[PDB]
Amino acid sequence: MIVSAIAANALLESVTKFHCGVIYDYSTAEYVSYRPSDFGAYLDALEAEVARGGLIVFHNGHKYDVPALTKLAKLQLNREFHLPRENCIDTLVLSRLIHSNLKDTDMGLLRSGKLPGKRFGSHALEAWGYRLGEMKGEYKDDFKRMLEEQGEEYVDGMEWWNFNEEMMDYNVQDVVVTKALLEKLLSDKHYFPPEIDFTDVGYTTFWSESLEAVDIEHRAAWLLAKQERNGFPFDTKAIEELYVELAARRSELLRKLTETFGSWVFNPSSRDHIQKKLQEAGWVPTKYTDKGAPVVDDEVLEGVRVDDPEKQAAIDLIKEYLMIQKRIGQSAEGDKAWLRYVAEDGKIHGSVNPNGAVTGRATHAFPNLAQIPGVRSPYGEQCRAAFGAEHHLDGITGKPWVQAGIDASGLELRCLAHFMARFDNGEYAHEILNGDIHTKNQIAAELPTRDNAKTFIYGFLYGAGDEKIGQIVGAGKERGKELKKKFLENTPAIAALRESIQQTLVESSQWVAGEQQVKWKRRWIKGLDGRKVHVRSPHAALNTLLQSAGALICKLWIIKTEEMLVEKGLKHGWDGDFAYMAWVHDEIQVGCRTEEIAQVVIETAQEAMRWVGDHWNFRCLLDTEGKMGPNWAICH
Amino acid sequence: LEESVEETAEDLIGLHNRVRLRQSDSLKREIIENGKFDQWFDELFGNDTFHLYDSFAEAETDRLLAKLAY
Amino acid sequence: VSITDLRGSGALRQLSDTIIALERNQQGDMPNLVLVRILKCRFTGDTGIAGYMEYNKETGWLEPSSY
Amino acid sequence: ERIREHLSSEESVGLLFSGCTGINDKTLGARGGEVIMVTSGSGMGKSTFVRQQALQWGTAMGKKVGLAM
């Protein structure tokens, strides 16, 4: 096993030159420093550990280091360099796996004065140096202050322009933190057994003798990192033709909404507006917002009735206006608007954090690819059309690629059937397969319509009170208790589900001054792969359990699907046959060169989904549904 | 005479490595993909200590006792 | 039903790797209720009563029962 | 190689008995090479139970099922 970290001139998207890199070998117990004229030997040193079947330790290597060293080797050395996914370890991923509950952990770290306020809960290399006590300083700061006593100034991120001896010393600093952080993660015996000193093993022993969660997360991080580099093809012209239809509508709406109110200036998106208005048109607020004056409150606006017809009719103009700002602020004027993120390949490369959550459901940002308005939401149809494989060319024919959208068919309710198959012997599970589970929940909870059962089952499982439940039948917090208790009597298994599991984490509970001081057995629920999935209050926790199952199911699902597609003969990327464009929890969007490839993609995903269920011996049956088409509005 | 040599070896391999390789769809795939199968396999049978019989197609006496005697 | 009630000589108690058995009282209050009993499983060795099932006179299927 | 071939190419747990879980909990389905023994009283659902397995396997989990009625 070797440990390293590198320093380049820029980010993964325009890096040009390799500066330095340090390699600590556990077998040699000694570091080795590299320099710009030593880039070639650096790649061989990594190849040598691959030949031995050892391991290579990087921080964020799956997402940056490994693809950058592949990219740098092509333009600088003109050689092909591809670190095998099996021979790579990412401390960042393990940190996100092992220490997903950092947010609490920092409380004691704050008391010490050892952890910066800007580096709270962060999983960056330097942020961990302060946690372990290895930060003698930071390269960026030993650069700025020393530039003063040299004359010349500082430009935002110029410390990486040129190879400097201070970078070479802080390049070591990043390596020793990676090593100590690795051993800090290897010292967690829940994930890494004591019987195996993983610091001196081959890759073959590392993955299997480690917890299964260790393997998936590195497979998940590697695949999704490929997805970011693949990117999502984007029709720039289409979104441009929308801002025109929106800005014109905004100005036309703004004009009509300035005839209704004067000044001494009507504001599009201000909170000091409705606060000044409606309570002058004859509207007395039903619900307020905190220390002073109610917020925008989109909810009440639908029900605001004022005796002024013009003011009343203007309410719906406000409803549209605010929404127009939302799409615009997401598609054009936002600091993280889509038009700002289109790369020079005609694609949007939205990033994704693998286990950036307690449960394992990922997070998307810059731009949040997982919040694009739905086709049911206004103008979402046009929005979804802007994200499509058709908006990509082709390596040869040029004929637009076809998109394949496959989602997990009702994963949440089937996950519920799996954990409750422990109490009903597959009763509820068969109701899924037999169909109309929302019809049974309707009968069990005594709801008038099937749609009311749908909004019930999800709210009840996740800890909704009685207001959302009461508003279903046009009531308040009153109606809810009898709706929840009746469902419990008609579905004992669900009640029995929360019995053994919720009493598996407690010995006895106790209320002290309004705070439950529960004596825990373990403040963490085990996931499908043995990882720690904490919760908070034992009053529900089920929501955490089900979402953990679902997110862990899809994570393995998208891994095996790609694994089978590669095994069948398909090549991953825009230069091969298919390319992952976006992963959104229970649905995925895959680009495909021909319709024939897309059909295989759909079938393989179903084959992988049954494979996952057999793998973890899932009590319930998992199915998926695929849609073929040009873009995303079609795949959903 | 009730399990083919691959299944009995499967038991022996798992038993040798303190696991139930038969009763884990997860463990079977594990040692295969990360190359842990050949590792345990050479560790056990590498000394040519284990030898088996396979036919399972209605074993007889003449001549099977001959094979046992042989 | 146990292993002795099995038709044929005592070879079926040996060759069969897994033995599924159904029991139901068609002259009682629950004729469609059928009990599943594992009599043998060389694979797991876990024997005993698995679960319950009900014969849907409409579909003719064996839907899994509670208990 | 035959051991390699077995673990890799067999469906592991080739299928799971449908109509009732718990059977899967105690048997983990049926494998390739074993012999599942189904029995009950005269007209108590021996044929009906097995016929569901033949149907389900050949429909949901597209296996090629052979029948000898």
Q: Where are the beta strands (DSSP E) in A239-346?
A: none
**DSSP SS3 for A316:** helix
| Alpha helices in B1-64, H assignment, sequence order | 5-16, 25-33, 36-45
> Nearest CA of chain A to the CA of D20: how many Å?
6
Q: Which of A76, A81, A371, A66 is nearest to A225 (CA)?
A: A66
What one-character-per-residue DSSP string does A175-213 give? HHHHHHHHHHHHT-TTTS-TTS-GGG--HHHHHHHS-HH
Whether residue B10 contacts residue B22, with contact meaning beta carbons closer than 8 Å, is answered with: yes
A614/B30 touch (CB, cutoff 8 Å), yes or no: no
The pair phi, psi for residue A149, each rounded to 5°, is: -75, 25
Cis bond leading into B63, ω under 30°?
yes
Paired sense of beta strands A2-8 and A56-58, if any = parallel
Whether residue A354 contacts residue A362, with contact meaning beta carbons closer than 8 Å, is answered with: yes
Terminal C-alpha separation, chain B: 18
- Return the sign of the alpha-carbon dihedral for residues A446, A447, A448, A451: negative
Whether residue A208 contacts residue B39, with contact meaning beta carbons closer than 8 Å, is answered with: no
- C44 contact B CB<8A: yes
Whether residue A241 contacts residue A383, with contact meaning beta carbons closer than 8 Å, is answered with: no
Distances (CA, A) of A123 to A199, A279, B22, C44: 21, 48, 40, 44
Return contacts of A138-143, CB within 8 angstroms, 24+ apart.
Answer: A138/A170, A139/A166, A139/A167, A139/A170, A139/A171, A139/A173, A142/A166, A142/A170, A143/A167
Hey, what are A114's tokens? Answer: 């050892």
Helices then strands, each counted (H, E), chain A: 23, 19
Residue length of chain D: 69
Nearest to A426 among D12, D22, D28 (CB): D22
Residue with tokens 């679902």: A550
Residues in CB range of A583: below 8 A, 6 or more apart: A224, A227, A352, A362, A554, A558, A589
Residue with tokens 């897309």: A598
- D14 contact C CB<8A: no
- Return the sign of the alpha-carbon dihedral for residues A409, A413, A415, A418: negative
The domain at A410-521 falls in which architecture?
Orthogonal Bundle (1.10)
Nearest to B6 among D2, D13, D28 (CB): D2
C35: which strand partners?
C23, C52
**DSSP SS3 for A427:** helix
- DSSP-assigned letter for residue D30: B
CATH for A347-409+522-636 is: 3.30.70.370
Q: Does the fold of domain A410-521 match that of domain A233-346?
A: no
Residues in CB range of A253: below 8 A, 6 or more apart: A317, A320, A321, A324
Distance CA A626, CA A557 (A): 14
Instruction: Decide: residue A631, CB within 10 A, 0-12 exposed, 13-18 middle, 19+ buried.
Output: buried
- Alpha-carbon torsion angle A586, A591, A594, A599, nearest 10: -10
Residue length of chain A: 636
Residue length of chain C: 67
Nearest to B28 among D5, D12, D33 (CB): D12
Distance CA A398, CA A553 (A): 36
Residue with tokens 């920092």: A106
Residues in CB range of D50: below 8 A, 6 or more apart: D38
Distance CA A533, CA A523 (A): 9
A584: which strand partners?
A587
Q: Which of A389, A408, A415 is nearest to A400 (CA)?
A: A389
Hey, what are A485's tokens? Answer: 């208790």
Terminal C-alpha separation, chain A: 45
Distances (CA, A) of A380 to A251, A376, A385, C30: 21, 7, 8, 55
Distance CA A108, CA A111 (A): 5
For chain C, give the longest Cα–Cα distance.
39
Instruction: Decide: residue C34, CB within 10 A, 0-12 exposed, 13-18 middle, 19+ buried.
Output: buried
Distance CA A227, CA A572 (A): 10
Distance CA A10, CA A580 (A): 25
Whether residue A115 contacts residue A105, with contact meaning beta carbons closer than 8 Å, is answered with: no
A421/D28 touch (CB, cutoff 8 Å), yes or no: no
Other CB atoms within a 10 A radius of the CB of residue A152 amount to 8
D20/C48 touch (CB, cutoff 8 Å), yes or no: no
Other CB atoms within a 10 A radius of the CB of residue A405 amount to 26
Distance CA A440, CA A413 (A): 12
Amino acid at A87: N
Hey, what are A117's tokens? Answer: 């306020």
**DSSP SS3 for A465:** coil
Paired sense of beta strands A2-8 and A347-348, if any = unpaired
Distance CA A200, CA A209 (A): 13
Q: Which of A66, A72, A65, A22 is nearest to A45 (CA)?
A: A22
Cis bond leading into A194, ω under 30°?
no
- What's the angle, vertex CA A407, arms to CA C63 and CA D21, rounded to 5? 20
Distance CA A478, CA A402 (A): 51
CATH for A1-232 is: 3.30.420.10
Whether residue A328 contacts residue A243, with contact meaning beta carbons closer than 8 Å, is answered with: yes
Experimental method: X-ray
Instruction: Return the half-sphere exposure (C-beta side, CA atoms, 13 A cut-off) of residue A414.
Output: 22
- B58 contact D CB<8A: no
C64/D38 touch (CB, cutoff 8 Å), yes or no: no
Domain borders along chain A are 1-232, 233-346, 347-409+522-636, 410-521
The pair phi, psi for residue A580, each rounded to 5°, is: -65, 125
| Chain D residue whose CA is closest to C20 | D38
Residue with tokens 């020393």: A146
Distances (CA, A) of A43 to A60, A175, A512, A622, B39: 18, 17, 60, 43, 28
* Angle, helix A309-331 to helix A236-259, in steps of 10 degrees: 150
Cα C15 to chain centroid distance, Å, stands at 18
B28/D13 touch (CB, cutoff 8 Å), yes or no: no
**Element containing residue A464 per DSSP (H, E):** none
Hey, what are B35's tokens? Answer: 């190359």
Whether residue A387 contacts residue A380, with contact meaning beta carbons closer than 8 Å, is answered with: no
Distance CA A399, CA A593 (A): 8
- What's the angle, vertex CA A93, arms to CA A109 and CA A65, rounded to 5? 110
CATH of A233-346, one of 1.20.1060.10, 2.30.30.110, 1.10.3210.10, 3.20.20.140: 1.20.1060.10
Residues in CB range of A537: below 8 A, 6 or more apart: A516
Hey, what are A279's tokens? Answer: 């309570």
Amino acid at A253: L
Distance CA A276, CA A298 (A): 16
- What's the angle, vertex CA A73, arms to CA A67 and CA A75, rounded to 5? 110
- CA gyration radius for chain A? 28
- DSSP-assigned letter for residue A370: G
Whether residue C19 contacts residue C31, with contact meaning beta carbons closer than 8 Å, is answered with: no
| Chain A residue whose CA is closest to D24 | A619
Distance CA B22, CA D12 (A): 9
Q: Which of A608, A546, A529, A505 is nearest to A418 (CA)?
A: A546
C15/B2 touch (CB, cutoff 8 Å), yes or no: yes
Residue length of chain B: 70
Distances (CA, A) of A125 to A30, A107, A176, A295: 21, 20, 10, 40
A425 contacts in chain C (CB < 8 Å): 50-52, 64-67
C53: which strand partners?
C34, C64
Whether residue A238 contacts residue A385, with contact meaning beta carbons closer than 8 Å, is answered with: yes
Q: Where are the beta strands (DSSP E) in A528-586?
A: 532-533, 578-584
- Return the sign of the alpha-carbon dihedral for residues A442, A443, A444, A448: positive
Instruction: Return the half-sphere exposure (C-beta side, CA atoms, 13 A cut-off) of residue A46.
Output: 30
Distances (CA, A) of C65 to A223, D11, D57: 42, 28, 21
Residue with tokens 């747990």: D13
Q: Which chains contact B through at least 3 pairs of Cβ atoms less than 8 Å apart?
A: A, C, D
Strands of the sheet with C48-55, listed across from one edge: C62-65, C48-55, C33-41, C18-23, D36-39
Other CB atoms within a 10 A radius of the CB of residue A74 amount to 11
D8 in a labelled binding site: no
Instruction: Return the half-sphere exposure (C-beta side, CA atoms, 13 A cut-off) of residue A630.
Output: 11
**Element containing residue A352 per DSSP (H, E):** strand A351-353
- What's the angle, vertex CA A29, arms to CA A28 and CA A33, rounded to 5? 85
Hey, what are A360's tokens? Answer: 């394992």
C48/D38 touch (CB, cutoff 8 Å), yes or no: no
- A424 contact C CB<8A: yes
In chain A, % helix, strand, coil (3-state, to 5) comes to 50, 10, 40
**DSSP SS3 for A272:** helix
Hey, what are A580's tokens? Answer: 């992952």
Distance CA D59, CA D63 (A): 7
Q: Which of B15, C51, A433, B22 is nearest to D28 (CA)?
A: B22
Residues in CB range of A252: below 8 A, 6 or more apart: none
